[model samples]
Target: RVQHLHDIRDLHRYYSSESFEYSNVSGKVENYNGSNVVRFNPKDQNHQLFLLGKDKEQYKEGLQGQNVFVVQELIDPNGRLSTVGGVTKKNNKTSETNTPLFVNKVNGEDLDASIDSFLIQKEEISLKELDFKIRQQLVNNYGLYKGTSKYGKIIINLKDENKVEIDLGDKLQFERMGDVLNSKDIRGISVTINQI
Candidate 1:
């Protein structure tokens, strides 16, 4: 049975990257060969990621095995932000910064609202309700983005259980503090729950 619910407000803060490697082109010094799609393999518990082709048509072409590089998202569940890494070159010196990033409230409010509404309905809800809640949340939230639909990861924090990290993939709802709730439709990125 479900009891409480919370929305995932931190999705927009997550980061994603294209899978590719750059190598100087043989003839063109300015151009490089960009190939492969990189993805993380959760099985190994290693930060390494497998590389795949641009199309990723076949299983072999996909990054099904092997460990290569580890990429961390700019933001996690707690609204900790990271900046995109940029290179600065001056006087033969180069520097980079990878501070966490954040999303303006405009892109996340709708999703948060939908999640909140669904969670308030009842304790035990079906998957259909969850999906509906997700769609509503996305529409309500992303509608304010003007044109582009932002993509990012969602993380949940369960403070009481001492579990500080939980990823809300594409699921419509999740359990926060023993209650089923929508993750992407919330006001604050982090929720602190205390039972009375």
Candidate 2:
């Protein structure tokens, strides 16, 4: 005779924040598993992780201060997902559907097309222009409130005038600059983000 245990109930609540500086607190739940748990891994590999206490007010406050900073080095108007101007050649003859292609500026036959795209379209905004716009946006978005235990602010700063810092909370920081774009000698710049 097999004894069938159909239902297993386990509940555990933990605080979670996008910011690495802030700690997470766990809430009460039944049949809580003693072995399995979730945690936020630090990307910097330098920062230490701490756990917060389980208090309703503190938990809510922590939740509010957990704003994550998004930093980027906008060199040629490229985003995290795609580059601004490179070259995309659709070779319909090679494939059934139009296949997107990246042409090397030096070796590819579409050199003229690529150059045109880079000068006119790929980098629509000059380096300075993009920098100004980014600063303005950061100020406008979270300039009023510095940040709280639950929700924090973001700051964008130019590093060595070549890189950008996206600092999350008072401690967790990640920096990235226009390395990929600057490879083309596009003149890279950095921006920083923190709570006002």
Candidate 3:
């Protein structure tokens, strides 16, 4: 069910459902890609997030639950915080087809889109292999600037336990992780981050 609110603080005060785990990620709706969207630490400040539907608990309980969640920014300010935004699976399903899979070439030079190769072969790669392959692409190929968002620096850490810890300083990484981690070969492994 979609809940309405007059203030963002009232998020935890009322809707602390046992199903979701609200991460300490805070951001406000702003302009990005020519649209008003939500971004983490737009001016650099700590904050929290609100989630909807199955929550983090139930969603992370199974292998198939490794899908990405979409944060929609809905605006309807009628003298209230009726503006809506939350991570949801319902919004996630439709994003699969339209998201650009390849970075377009710029300045008449072919961008080293070798990352597409790994994605095409997401057959049965291990966590270690995944880490190595990605680093080869993002680290050696793309460099630091290519890995950043409007927020801060991005870091992809491979935890010793085989889990992935990504510093989502950039919201784009979330979409990238959504594509990479969505593979069944990486099943049971999960992505963790503070905010984007």
Highest lDDT scorer: 3
- Backbone clash tally for model 2? 20
TM-score of 2: 0.17
How does each model score on lDDT?
A: 0.26, 0.22, 0.28
Better of 2 and 3 by TM-score: 3
lDDT score at residue 2, model 2, on the 0-100 scale:
12
Q: How accurate is candidate 2 locally (lDDT)?
A: 0.22
* Candidate 3 lDDT over residue span 91-180, tens digit each: 122221111122222222333332233341322222223333333333333442232211222233222334454332222221222223
| Candidate closest to the true structure, highest TM-score | 1
- Point out the higher-scoring one by lDDT: 1 or 3: 3
2 versus 3: better lDDT goes to: 3
Alpha carbon lDDT at 53, candidate 1: 24
Root-mean-square deviation of every model: 19.5, 23.5, 16.5
The sequence of per-residue lDDT tens digits that candidate 1 reaches over residues 48-135 is: 2112221122222333222121223333344332211110111111122121212223233333322232232322222223323333
